[PDB]
Amino acid sequence: DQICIGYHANNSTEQVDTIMEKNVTVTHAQDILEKTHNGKLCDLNGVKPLILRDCSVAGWLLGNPMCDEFLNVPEWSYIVEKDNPVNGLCYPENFNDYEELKHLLSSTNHFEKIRIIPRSSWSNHDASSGVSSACPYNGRSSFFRNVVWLIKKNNAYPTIKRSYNNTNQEDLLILWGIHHPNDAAEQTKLYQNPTTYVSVGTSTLNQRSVPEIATRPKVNGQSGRMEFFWTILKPNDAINFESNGNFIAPEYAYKIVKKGGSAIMKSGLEYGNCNTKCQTPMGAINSSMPFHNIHPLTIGECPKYVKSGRLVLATGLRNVP
Amino acid sequence: GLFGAIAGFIEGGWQGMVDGWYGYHHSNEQGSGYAADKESTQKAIDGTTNKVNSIIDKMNTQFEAVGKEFNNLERRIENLNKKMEDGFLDVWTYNAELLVLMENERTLDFHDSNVKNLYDKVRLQLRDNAKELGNGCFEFYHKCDNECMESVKNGTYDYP
Ligand SMILES: CC(=O)N[C@@H]1[C@@H](O[C@@H]2O[C@H](CO)[C@H](O)[C@H](O[C@]3(C(=O)O)C[C@H](O)[C@@H](NC(C)=O)[C@H]([C@H](O)[C@H](O)CO)O3)[C@H]2O)[C@H](O)[C@@H](CO)O[C@H]1O
Ligand SMILES: *[C@@H]1O[C@H](CO)[C@@H](O[C@@H]2O[C@H](CO)[C@@H](O)[C@H](O)[C@H]2NC(C)=O)[C@H](O)[C@H]1NC(C)=O
Ligand SMILES: *[C@@H]1O[C@H](CO)[C@@H](O[C@@H]2O[C@H](CO)[C@@H](O)[C@H](O)[C@H]2NC(C)=O)[C@H](O)[C@H]1NC(C)=O
Ligand SMILES: *[C@@H]1O[C@H](CO)[C@@H](O)[C@H](O)[C@H]1NC(C)=O
Numbered sequence: 473d474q475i476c477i478g479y480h481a482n483n484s485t486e487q488v489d490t491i492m493e494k495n496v497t498v499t500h501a502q503d504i505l506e507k508t509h510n511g512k513l514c515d516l517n518g519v520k521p522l523i524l525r526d527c528s529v530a531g532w533l534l535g536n537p538m539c540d541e542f543l544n545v546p547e548w549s550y551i552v553e554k555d556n557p558v559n560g561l562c563y564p565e566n567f568n569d570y571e572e573l574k575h576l577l578s579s580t581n582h583f584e585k586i587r588i589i590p591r592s593s594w595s596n597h598d599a600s601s602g603v604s605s606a607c608p609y610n611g612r613s614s615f616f617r618n619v620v621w622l623i624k625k626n627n628a629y630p631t632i633k634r635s636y637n638n639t640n641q642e643d644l645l646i647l648w649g650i651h652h653p654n655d656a657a658e659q660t661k662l663y664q665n666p667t668t669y670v671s672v673g674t675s676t677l678n679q680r681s682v683p684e685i686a687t688r689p690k691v692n693g694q695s696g697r698m699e700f701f702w703t704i705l706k707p708n709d710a711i712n713f714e715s716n717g718n719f720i721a722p723e724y725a726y727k728i729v730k731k732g733g734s735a736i737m738k739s740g741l742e743y744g745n746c747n748t749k750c751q752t753p754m755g756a757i758n759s760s761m762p763f764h765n766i767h768p769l770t771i772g773e774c775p776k777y778v779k780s781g782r783l784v785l786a787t788g789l790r791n792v793p
Numbered sequence: 794g795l796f797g798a799i800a801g802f803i804e805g806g807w808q809g810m811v812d813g814w815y816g817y818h819h820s821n822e823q824g825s826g827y828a829a830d831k832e833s834t835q836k837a838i839d840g841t842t843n844k845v846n847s848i849i850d851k852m853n854t855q856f857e858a859v860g861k862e863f864n865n866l867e868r869r870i871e872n873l874n875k876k877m878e879d880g881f882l883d884v885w886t887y888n889a890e891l892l893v894l895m896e897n898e899r900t901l902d903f904h905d906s907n908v909k910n911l912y913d914k915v916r917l918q919l920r921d922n923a924k925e926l927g928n929g930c931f932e933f934y935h936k937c938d939n940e941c942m943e944s945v946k947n948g949t950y951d952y953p
C-alpha cells in the first residue's frame with residue numbers, strides 16, 4: 473500500500489531553449505514572437521494612406537503633370553513612396569534641403585493646397601510660355617502645375633515685386649524656384665535682362681539667388697536646370713519676392729495641418745483595401761504578441777521589433793516520457 | 794534537474810494526470826489513481842503567469858526606428874544614423890533573447906523545486922507511518938485507504 477508524489481506529462485512537442493541545454497521538450501510553452509503580416513498597405517484605423525505610386529514628394533508638391541492624381545490629396549495616415557519614383561522633377565534640377573522637407577512631412581497628416589498668387593496676376597509678364605518638352609502633358613509641353621515659369625513680355629522683364637501675408641491659421645509651406653539657363657543668349661531670349669536675381673524675404677528669411685550658368689548634359693532633353701526653394705511662412709508673417717528674371721514664382725502653397733504623427737514609408741506595394749492597427753512596409757500586423765520580426769520601420773500600435781527567428785517562453789515543465 | 798526531483802530521483806512524469814502540474818498516485822486495496830494538487834499547481838500557475846507578464850512589460854519601453862533620408866553628401870550622418878538604429882535593435886534583440894533564455898532556465902527549476910517541496914511536505918508528514926522508497930513513492934506499513942489517503946492530501950493527516 474502506497475502514495476506517490478509526481479508531475480504532469482503529455483504529448484507536447486513544444487521546445488524551449490536555456491543557457492545550458494537547447495531544445496528542451498516541455499509540457500506547455502507560450503510563443504511571444506509574431507512572424508506574419510498580411511502583405512498589404514492598409515488604412516490605419518480607418519484612415520487611408522497617401523500612396524504616391526510613380527510620383528515622388530517633389531513631383532507631388534511642385535505639381536509635375538504626370539502626377540495630377542495628387543493635385544489635392546486628402547488627410548492621410550502615413551505616406552508611401554517608391555524607392556525611385558520615375559516622376560519627380562520633370563524639368564531637371566535640384567531641390568534645396570529636400571530631405572528636411574521630407575522629414576517635415578512626418579510632423580503632419582495633411583497638406584491643404586491654396587492659391588496665394590493667381591496665375592492671372594502677372595499683367596506685365598508672360599505667364600503662358602513657361603512650358604518645356606521635359607514636362608509632357610497631353611502630348612504637349614507643360615510644366616509643374618503649382619508654380620509658374622514667367623517669361624519676358626514685349627521684350628521686357630520689368631522688375632517684379634510681390635508680397636503675400638499669411639492670413640491663415642496654419643503654417644504655410646511656400647515653394648518657388650529660379651532657372652539656370654544654358655548660356656547668356658538663352659538668358660536674354662527668355663528674360664531680356666542679363667544680370668538677374670530672385671530675392672526673398674520673410675521675418676526669418678533673407679535670400680538672393682543669382683542664376684548660375686553652365687553647360688551640362690541633357691536630362692529629359694534639357695541642358696537647363698531648375699533650383700527649388702521652400703520656407704515655412706508663419707501665420708501673420710509676410711513673404712517678399714523681388715526679381716528681374718529667371719523667377720519660378722509660386723501659385724499654390726500648402727497650409728500645414730499638424731495633426732502630426734506620420735513619417736514616410738518605402739514600398740512598391742499599392743493599396744490593399746484593408747484596415748489595420750499596425751503597418752509595416754511589407755504588410756500589416758494584427759497580433760497580440762509582445763514581439764515581432766517583420767520590419768523595424770513600423771507605424772501604429774505595434775509589437776516590439778527584434779531580429780529573433782524564434783522566441784518561446786517555457787510555461788509548463790520538462791516533458792518526460 | 795537543479796533540485797533533483799523532475800527527471801531525477803523521480804524518473805518520469807505521469808502521462809495520465811491531465812488535472813495539473815503536480816500531484817499524487819495512491820495505491821491500496823480499494824484501488825489506485827492520480828490526483829493533482831491544487832494548492833501547489835495553482836501557486837505555480839500564478840507565479841509563472843506573472844513572469845510572462847513581467848517579461849512582456851519590461852520589454853514594452855524599448856527602442857523604435859524612424860525613417861530619415863540623406864543625400865549623396867551626407868553619407869557620414871546617414872551611416873551614423875544606420876549605425877545607431879542597428880545598434881539599439883541589436884541591443885534590444887539581445888535583451889529579448891537573453892531574458893527569455895535566463896528565465897526559461899529558472900522556470901524549469903521552479904517546477905523541479907516545486908516538486909521537491911511537495912514531495913518534502915509529504916516525507917516529513919508521513920513521518921514513521923510509511924517507508925521512503927526513493928522513487929517518489931511512500932509505502933506505509935499498516936494498511937491505509939482512501940479515507941486515509943485523502944488525509945495526506947487534505948494536509949490534515951495524523952490523529953494529532
Ligand atoms: C525650334 C527648335 O525646336 N529648336 C531646336 C533646338 O531645340 C531647342 O533647344 C533649346 C536649347 O538651345 C531648348 O532646349 C528648347 O527646348 C525648350 C523646352 O524646354 O522644351 C523649348 C521651350 O519652349 C522653352 N521654354 C521656354 C519657357 O522658353 C525651353 C527653355 O527655353 C529652355 O529650357 C531654357 O533652359 O526650352 C529646344 O526646343 C535644337 O537644340 C537644335 C538642334 O537640333 O535645333 C533647333 O531647331
Ligand atoms: C499681415 O497682416 C496683418 C493684418 O491683417 C498684420 O497684423 C496686424 O497689424 C495691425 C496693424 O497694421 C495690428 O493692429 C494688428 O494687431 C495685427 N493683427 C494681428 C493678427 O496681429 C501683420 O503685421 C501683417 N504681416 C506683416 C508682417 O506684414
Ligand atoms: C479532511 O480531513 C478529514 C478529517 O477531519 C478527512 O476525513 C473525514 O472523516 C470524517 C469521519 O471521521 C468524515 O465524516 C468526513 O467526511 C471526512 N472529511 C471531512 C472532515 O469532511 C477528509 O478525508 C479530508 N479531506 C476531505 C475529503 O475533506
Ligand atoms: C495529444 O495526445 C493525445 C493522446 O494521449 C491525443 O488524443 C491528442 O489529440 C494529442 N494532441 C495532439 C498532438 O494534437
Ligand SMILES: *[C@@H]1O[C@H](CO)[C@@H](O)[C@H](O)[C@H]1NC(C)=O
Nearest residue numbers: 487488489493494495496497
Ligand atoms: C533544435 O531542434 C530543431 C527542430 O526543429 C532543429 O531545427 C535545431 O537544429 C535543433 N537545435 C539543435 C540544438 O541542434
Ligand SMILES: *[C@@H]1O[C@H](CO)[C@@H](O)[C@H](O)[C@H]1NC(C)=O
Nearest residue numbers: 747748749750756757758759
Ligand atoms: C484581428 O483578428 C481578430 C480575430 O479574428 C479579429 O477579431 C480582429 O478584428 C482582427 N483585427 C484586424 C485589424 O483585422
